[PDB]
Amino acid sequence: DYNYKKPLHNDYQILDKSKIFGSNSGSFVMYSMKKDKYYIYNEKESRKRYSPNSTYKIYLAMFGLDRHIINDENSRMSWNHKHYPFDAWNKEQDLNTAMQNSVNWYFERISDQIPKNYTATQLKQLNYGNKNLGSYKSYWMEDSLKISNLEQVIVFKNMMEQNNHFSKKAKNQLSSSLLIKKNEKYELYGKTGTGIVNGKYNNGWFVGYVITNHDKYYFATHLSDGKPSGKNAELISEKILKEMGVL
Amino acid sequence: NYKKPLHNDYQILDKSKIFGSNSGSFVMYSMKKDKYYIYNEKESRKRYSPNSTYKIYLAMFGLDRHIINDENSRMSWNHKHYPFDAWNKEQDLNTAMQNSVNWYFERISDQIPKNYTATQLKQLNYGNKNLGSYKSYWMEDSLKISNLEQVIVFKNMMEQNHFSKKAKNQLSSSLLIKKNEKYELYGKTGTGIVNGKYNNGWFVGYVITNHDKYYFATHLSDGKPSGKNAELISEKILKEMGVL
Numbered sequence: 041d042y043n044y045k046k047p048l049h050n051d052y053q054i055l056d057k058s059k060i061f062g063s064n065s066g067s068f069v070m071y072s073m074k075k076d077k078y079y080i081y082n083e084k085e086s087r088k089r090y091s092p093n094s095t096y097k098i099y100l101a102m103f104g105l106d107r108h109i110i111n112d113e114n115s116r117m118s119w120n121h122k123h124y125p126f127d128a129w130n131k132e133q134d135l136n137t138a139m140q141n142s143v144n145w146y147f148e149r150i151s152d153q154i155p156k157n158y159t160a161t162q163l164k165q166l167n168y169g170n171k172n173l174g175s176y177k178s179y180w181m182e183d184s185l186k187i188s189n190l191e192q193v194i195v196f197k198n199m200m201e202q203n204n205h206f207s208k209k210a211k212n213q214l215s216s217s218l219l220i221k222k223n224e225k226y227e228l229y230g231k232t233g234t235g236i237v238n239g240k241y242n243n244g245w246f247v248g249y250v251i252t253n254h255d256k257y258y259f260a261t262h263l264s265d266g267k268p269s270g271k272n273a274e275l276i277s278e279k280i281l282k283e284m285g286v287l
Numbered sequence: 288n289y290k291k292p293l294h295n296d297y298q299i300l301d302k303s304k305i306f307g308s309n310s311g312s313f314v315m316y317s318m319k320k321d322k323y324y325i326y327n328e329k330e331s332r333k334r335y336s337p338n339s340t341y342k343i344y345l346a347m348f349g350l351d352r353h354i355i356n357d358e359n360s361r362m363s364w365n366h367k368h369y370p371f372d373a374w375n376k377e378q379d380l381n382t383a384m385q386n387s388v389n390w391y392f393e394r395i396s397d398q399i400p401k402n403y404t405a406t407q408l409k410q411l412n413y414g415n416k417n418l419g420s421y422k423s424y425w426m427e428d429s430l431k432i433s434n435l436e437q438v439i440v441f442k443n444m445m446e447q448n449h450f451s452k453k454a455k456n457q458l459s460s461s462l463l464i465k466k467n468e469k470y471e472l473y474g475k476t477g478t479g480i481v482n483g484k485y486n487n488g489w490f491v492g493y494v495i496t497n498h499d500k501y502y503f504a505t506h507l508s509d510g511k512p513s514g515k516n517a518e519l520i521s522e523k524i525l526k527e528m529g530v531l
């Protein structure tokens with residue numbers, strides 16, 4: 041019920057990206073590693089907490105790797121033969137296929153193997169939003185757990201960049217699963233999220249990072265109105281990153 | 288020259304226009320269709336030094352013999368000045384493969400006995416299998432392989448083996464060049480220079496699409512036969528063929 045209030049002790053730039061957002065409402069946040077600087081479109085809104093829905097698969101994947109539920113030799117999980125609505129979900133998966141095709145059951149299976157105590161300790165160490173696990177059952181799916189767009193960037197950057205307990209091998213395997221585009225100029229990584237309530241999209245995300253020859257940027261777009269889908273959050277992120285000369 | 292018959296379906300191509308001022312050959316193999324596609328059949332069978340495309344094999348060997356590993360593929364720079372800025376630093380398998388850092392792979396080769404190599408080359412059916420004086424044998428020296436063979440050998444090495452799935456995946460990650468919505472392109476260039484002129488250019492790799500996996504290789508013998516131009520020609524041909 042409370043939003044993100046911790047102040048930023050960094051160089052900061054206010055952005056005007058309303059033309060790219062068009063009819064869609066939300067916020068955009070980017071962090072430059074080299075400059076130690078935040079760039080934010082709609083800063084008050086960037087601090088409003090929302091369910092992370094599928095961006096939380098980034099963390100379920102890191103936790104699954106840290107607890108050795110999945111590893112670099114075997115991240116394969118069997119399909120249980122239940123009919124899912126998306127054909128890409130109706131088959132055996134590994135980490136890369138599950139992440140790419142946002143296969144909910146794969147991450148739910150990892151979550152069922154993780155003790156609440158471990159998850160609470162990690163969310164505390166990561167300062168993950170409201171750290172609210174609720175009933176601890178699909179808590180990241182439009183439920184108790186909430187995080188702001190600004191925190192999505194701070195939290196991800198810190199998980200990946202801090203000198204912490206997650207192994208280099210786990211970070212590498214997670215990164216590989218998140219790669220979307222690679223060309224001569226950059227590598228773009230990221231994860232979409234889409235929520236639906238009462239037949240209407242209501243919570244869209246695209247969380248990621250870009251590695252260029254000059255810098256590394258962490259970023260996130262959140263959409264709450266208009267056509268708030270993860271696919272639209274991704275398109276908006278790509279347009280903003282190209283407009284700022286990152287891509 | 289490579290003389291063994293192809294025992295698979297194949298299509299002979301004319302990609303003469305793309306090659307243009309340059310000369311050489313192109314070979315592709317489709318996993319799903321179990322078919323080869325070949326431009327300039329005669330040249331595709333001529334054997335040439337693999338130069339830097341052999342880094343693919345030294346990296347595999349390095350991973351097999353645990354000279355380089357999953358947790359650590361890092362190698363410190365000895366501080367010697369090299370003509371390329373990208374070589375003048377510490378390396379890992381990925382930076383070494385991307386920037387074709389000769390010293391990294393030479394250091395792996397020096398730790399491999401002739402015995403192990405001779406058996407891998409025999410197992411892999413690697414060109415003329417000629418290891419010669421066993422020094423920098425892959426560098427415009429004794430070891431030679433045809434463009435047709437670069438595809439058959441690589442496909443077999445990755446798809447048929449005593450090599451680990453984890454080693455194959457690590458080698459694969461080091462070879463990734465391009466990735467988009469439609470495909471992932473992996474590959475390694477090779478450039479040879481003799482008497483001051485580019486004389487032997489290569490681009491060997493594979494493409495993964497949502498529908499198939501294709502192994503391919505372009506060899507250049509005239510015009511401006513650099514690995515850079517072999518890569519350019521490969522991308523134009525793959526685009527024309529619908530692989531992209």
Ligand SMILES: *C(=O)[C@@H](NC(=O)/C(=N\OC(C)(C)C(=O)O)c1csc(N)n1)[C@@H]1N=C(C(=O)O)C(=C)CS1
Binds near residue numbers: 234237
């Ligand atoms: C992650 O965000 C996942 N989203 C969902 O499961 C939810 N809605 O998605 C679909 C499947 C389209 C639906 O209409 O049910 C959802 C979770 S909580 C809530 N109220 N709705 C998956 N991720 C994506 C993505 O953007 O990557 C999807 C497009 C859907 S599945």
Ligand SMILES: *C(=O)[C@@H](NC(=O)/C(=N\OC(C)(C)C(=O)O)c1csc(N)n1)[C@@H]1N=C(C(=O)O)C(=C)CS1
Binds near residue numbers: 340387389477478
């Ligand atoms: C692998 O092919 C490597 N090639 C070389 O080291 C050789 N020549 O490179 C140049 C830069 C042209 C030189 O003037 O030394 C070479 C090996 S044996 C021989 N007679 N020449 C490296 N790979 C590439 C590549 O295409 O990836 C290079 C452009 C050069 S270094």
